[PDB]
Amino acid sequence: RECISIHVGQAGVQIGNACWELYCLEHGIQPDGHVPRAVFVDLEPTVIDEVRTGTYRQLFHPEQLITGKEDAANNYARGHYTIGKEIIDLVLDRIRKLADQCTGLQGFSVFHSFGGGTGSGFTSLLMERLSVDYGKKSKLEFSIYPAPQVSTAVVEPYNSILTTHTTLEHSDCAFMVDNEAIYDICRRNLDIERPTYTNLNRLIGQIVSSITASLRFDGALNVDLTEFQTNLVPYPRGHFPLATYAPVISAEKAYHEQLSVAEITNACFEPANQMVKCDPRHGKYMACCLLYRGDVVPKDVNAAIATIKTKRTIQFVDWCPTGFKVGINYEPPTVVPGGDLAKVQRAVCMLSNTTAIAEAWARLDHKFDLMYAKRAFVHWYVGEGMEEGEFSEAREDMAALEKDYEEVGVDS
Ligand SMILES: Nc1nc2c(ncn2[C@@H]2O[C@H](COP(=O)(O)OP(=O)(O)OP(=O)(O)O)[C@@H](O)[C@H]2O)c(=O)[nH]1
Numbered sequence: 001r002e003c004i005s006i007h008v009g010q011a012g013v014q015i016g017n018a019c020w021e022l023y024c025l026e027h028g029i030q031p032d033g034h035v036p037r038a039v040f041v042d043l044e045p046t047v048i049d050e051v052r053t054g055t056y057r058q059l060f061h062p063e064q065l066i067t068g069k070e071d072a073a074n075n076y077a078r079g080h081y082t083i084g085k086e087i088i089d090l091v092l093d094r095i096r097k098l099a100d101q102c103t104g105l106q107g108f109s110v111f112h113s114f115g116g117g118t119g120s121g122f123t124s125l126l127m128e129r130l131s132v133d134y135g136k137k138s139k140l141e142f143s144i145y146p147a148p149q150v151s152t153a154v155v156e157p158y159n160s161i162l163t164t165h166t167t168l169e170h171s172d173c174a175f176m177v178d179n180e181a182i183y184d185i186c187r188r189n190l191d192i193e194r195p196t197y198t199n200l201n202r203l204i205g206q207i208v209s210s211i212t213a214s215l216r217f218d219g220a221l222n223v224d225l226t227e228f229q230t231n232l233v234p235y236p237r238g239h240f241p242l243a244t245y246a247p248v249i250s251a252e253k254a255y256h257e258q259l260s261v262a263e264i265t266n267a268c269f270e271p272a273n274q275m276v277k278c279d280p281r282h283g284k285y286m287a288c289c290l291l292y293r294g295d296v297v298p299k300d301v302n303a304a305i306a307t308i309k310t311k312r313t314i315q316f317v318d319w320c321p322t323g324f325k326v327g328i329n330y331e332p333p334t335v336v337p338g339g340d341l342a343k344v345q346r347a348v349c350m351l352s353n354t355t356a357i358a359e360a361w362a363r364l365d366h367k368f369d370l371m372y373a374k375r376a377f378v379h380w381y382v383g384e385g386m387e388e389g390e391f392s393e394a395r396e397d398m399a400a401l402e403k404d405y406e407e408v409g410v411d412s
């Protein structure tokens with residue numbers, strides 16, 4: 001029934017504090033109410049401390065807040081092997097101590113930031129140690145994969161080609177939200193050149209609320225977590241769909257809010273609104289899980305979608321007749337009291353697997369090579385319990401992820 005969550009890496013923790021905020025906010029549980037149902041991991045104390053100093057301070061147990069005073073290191077190796085190792089046990093312990101206390105759970109919603117040290121590496125083995133300790137569950141990892149041109153870390157790819165290959169054979173469904181492609185939404189669909197990280201977080205903090213929160217919440221067309229991976233992954237590769245939200249209108253500027261279904265659903269497939277720089281440049285969808293929430297008439301959907309199924313310029317895979325999982329919830333969304341999110345009475349958090357990422361992975365793989373081609377910051381990992389193996393052998397890994405996402409599509 002439940003779904004634990006492990007927010008790993010400063011980012012996964014910032015986003016965590018955010019997604020965790022939106023929660024109580026739409027459940028009437030102020031600062032000090034019940035008890036969360038997740039944990040927080042980081043090898044840099046000062047960040048988890050922010051959850052220990054700032055807002056939502058006492059809504060957590062100093063037990064579900066793991067820290068390694070030591071060093072973060074923007075390098076996979078160190079975070080996965082060398083350092084990150086020391087903490088893992090302890091980490092697990094909570095996701096085994098928190099996993100027990102419950103009643104027939106469904107899985108762990110993992111929150112990490114692909115291209116980091118504590119986020120890429122660590123998790124790599126966290127999800128790793130999970131796939132074995134609970135192979136019998138769902139492993140949906142919600143990632144924030146590398147901005148297409150606006151990356152931060154100098155190494156980023158090293159850290160992301162490595163978190164992909166190690167987690168690939170362990171996740172159930174990996175959701176992806178592109179940090180940059182979300183900015184566009186903040187520039188083009190909300191207008192603000194002042195987007196603090198605290199915003200992107202409010203956003204995913206939204207799209208995510210549509211996943212677990214409301215879905216695990218009764219409705220006219222419930223959709224379990226398992227449901228996802230089933231209706232969402234055509235193949236064992238921990239396939240990565242993309243998150244998209246519909247009413248991303250500004251709560252100040254424009255106001256046409258009352259945008260009946262027929263509109264908000266069409267607003268999902270236009271590439272300028274998908275929290276991912278993977279513009280459907282060719283990527284044929286192969287399965288979409290349209291999660292609606294608020295006042296929505298099933299016919300409105302079983303029509304708004306029909307209209308789409310016949311737009312053709314939206315070309316769905318061949319081997320897939322119908323790939324539209326319609327998830328209907330009741331309670332409308334719940335916008336921050338005064339952030340910058342419109343606040344409509346219905347939304348569409350549609351996520352999907354698109355042959356599109358054939359790109360995004362490509363462009364991120366290429367990156368890697370360029371540097372590896374010169375070993376660049378390699379000495380930083382080797383000296384951290386890794387080898388020419390793990391790199392070269394994780395490169396070959398993704399290689400067959402560029403072929404995979406190619407074969408499962410583009411062909412009939
Ligand atoms: N959406 C979003 N992205 C974030 C946030 N914080 C960081 N990121 C992104 O995630 C990546 C940064 O990872 P870091 O903060 O360097 O590292 P970490 O993953 O926390 O772990 P360490 O490297 O060991 O510190 C960059 O690509 C950032 O753009 C956040 O609050 N929200």
Ligand SMILES: [Mg+2]
Nearest residue numbers: 009010044072
């Ligand atoms: Mg950090």
